[PDB]
Design a protein around this nucleic acid. Sequence first.
DNA 1: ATCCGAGTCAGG
DNA 2: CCTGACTCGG
Length: 579
Amino acid sequence: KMAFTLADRVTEEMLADKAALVVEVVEENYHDAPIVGIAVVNEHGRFFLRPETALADPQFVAWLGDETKKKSMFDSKRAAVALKWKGIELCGVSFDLLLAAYLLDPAQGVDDVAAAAKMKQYEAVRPDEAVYGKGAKRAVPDEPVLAEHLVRKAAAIWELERPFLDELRRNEQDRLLVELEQPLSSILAEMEFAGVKVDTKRLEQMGKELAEQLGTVEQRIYELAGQEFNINSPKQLGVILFEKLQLPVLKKTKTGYSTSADVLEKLAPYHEIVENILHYRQLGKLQSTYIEGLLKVVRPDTKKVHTIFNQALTQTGRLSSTEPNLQNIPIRLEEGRKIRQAFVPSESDWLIFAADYSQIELRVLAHIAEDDNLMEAFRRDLDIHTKTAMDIFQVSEDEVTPNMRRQAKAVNFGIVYGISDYGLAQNLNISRKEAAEFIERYFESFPGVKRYMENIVQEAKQKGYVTTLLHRRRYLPDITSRNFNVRSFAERMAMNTPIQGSAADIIKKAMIDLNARLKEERLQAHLLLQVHDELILEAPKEEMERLCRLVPEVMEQAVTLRVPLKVDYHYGSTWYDAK
DNA sequence: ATCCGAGTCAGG
DNA sequence: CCTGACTCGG
Ligand SMILES: Nc1nc2c(ncn2[C@H]2C[C@H](O)[C@@H](COP(=O)(O)OP(=O)(O)OP(=O)(O)O)O2)c(=O)[nH]1
Ligand SMILES: [Ca+2]
Ligand SMILES: [Ca+2]
């Protein structure tokens, strides 16, 4: 047991201009949830306050909003939003222990202070699972244990602040935490709290048609299958297809036989049920995930949806979006995209405005690779897909049929991570002999992409890690693995990580430089979303002319590469219409 | 119950 | 290559 004042009230010696602060949201989704406890640690001691009391105090609430009071926490963003929900603001966070651990070694998957502490040999603090538990397991314990815990954390944060910073500084990532991640964290905070408005009525009439649509196919499947079965269980389905209907087994999952859309395109010719199955899956994924899914989570009063961008999960520096995931709304098949029509501004007479990097990930290859061909393609603003098709067929700026392009494109999608001939051949539905025969041609057509791939794999061998434009790391012990396929995975990570990685650094940065301008220019615009390479804003309809310059200007100039980045922008009265 | 793992597919 | 949500079913 470790002692601390167990406060009933706020003494001012809790308001020192530097403290580790802990603000416990024990709910798994932080949006509008109970704050269960608050521990503060400072030069004057270690204190515990109950939220009810604490949150009422104009003295405390004041200290919180003060950017001159420096706090140190773990996942300030969790506390930030939870507090924004209470109309309380949180400023002057100087060190976030979650973001730090995450830059040191994202693979450790640090989810709580206990994890962060292992890293630096500190152990007088307990995991979350130990105090709370797993599933229907997780519960809020009594104050005695709670106080003890929130303090032990806060204590650790105070303690680990400089051990952590010293390794970042040694690692060459001091300005990644300070200038990049922490600034962004605030920004995501606002974004998640702003929310995006959904048109629940249109979502309702989309679902309405899809059930009638779906009933229909369902029946047809059962008709031609000869019997009923749960189509969704592919274990049950394969039995219908490859046993009772006697069909060729072409691909195979590690368990039994495979029914991935890839195999079905191939089985189509073989029997009329095949395409009915594909239709059924597509229609059903809309309804399950983008109708019943979203509608399950609009906030009923405001009609908005509040995502959580997880700044500290991905192994390569992307963000992720959870519950719901606004980073995978349909856009590819035309009927899918209609969903986007349900994403509307939150103010009458405002517009969604959306801008994105053209080929960001490739452009980064070009810059990191220092291949001449690719650098020139981007500098002359050539349609990079069209130039690719040319180079792999050795043909003209018009002898490119549309199919030669669906092919060139797919290379550019995989050459960002050393795609396998086998792997490629899958997406393209071709013979593996042709897959590598396009690969072969790409490489002699862009042999600076070849070197890089050679080189990066060997730097990974030397250093045990790769890095990115802004010095994010990724360790890769499996690089020297005994085992062909494991060494191989690790070798594509070896080469792809600096690409995904910089691409993400660059946009995270664009977002900071953006908030920065909008705030100076007194503008009403604010970011709603990030989808890996686009930004989505809502602004007053009288503000587009500006954003059309501003947003591209700031995005393009976010960093400086041996290629010019390229941005596209569109705005409409909905997401669908900004395309 | 309740957890986890694969599967499939939506996006990058 | 990097995710996540929904789904069955060991
Ligand atoms: N990794 C991956 N990303 C894809 C794939 N297909 C589409 N994308 C995503 C990644 C890009 O950020 C985004 C670019 O949009 P498009 O697919 O329409 O390509 P783009 O507009 O650059 O070319 P286009 O103008 O359509 O000829 O799409 C794929 O097969 N793999
Ligand atoms: Ca395009
Ligand atoms: Ca895109």
